[PDB]
Design a protein around this nucleic acid. Structure first.
Length: 58
RNA sequence: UAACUUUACGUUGUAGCUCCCUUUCUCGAAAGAGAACCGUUGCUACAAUAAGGCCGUCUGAAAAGAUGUGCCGCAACGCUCUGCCCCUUAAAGGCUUUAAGGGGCAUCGUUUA
């Protein structure tokens, strides 16, 4: 029900998101909601092996 | 990057031989020689190699036998199914239940046999 642009910042272990409500003419007027979502990055951390590798070996 | 077929080790447990050696026997004026339990060095063999769970075929009413280039098990992603949790709404007795609907996660699904 709100006219807003969603900005995403993506990295190997993080996604930051922001919502900015914009004008009728597409100009930003209000900062609505922002958050950060962090996860574990999809590799064996020290060596860069794949997470699946240990399972395939076994 | 996801997917293979095998080899060869290593680890542990058990068997034979073996290197040491702690105590306890027996001998012997010492030194030791042989022994018993255990420890454990080395060589060889077998079993297991995630912890756990299954199938196919043949003879049998079945029990079970026989049998095999037998199968899965540490991941990723997803919500079709199933489970837990969260929410919205409707109905009936802020409490409880039900239904529908929408999600998160998985002990659920797919890759996958």
């Amino acid at each position: 029900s709100i006219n807003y642009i969603l900005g995403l910042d993506i990295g190997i272990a993080s996604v930051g998101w922001a919502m900015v409500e914009i004008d009728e003419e597409e100009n930003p007027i209000r900062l609505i909601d922002l958050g950060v979502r962090v996860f574990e990055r999809a590799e064996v951390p020290k060596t860069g092996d794949s997470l699946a590798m240990a399972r395939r070996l076994a």
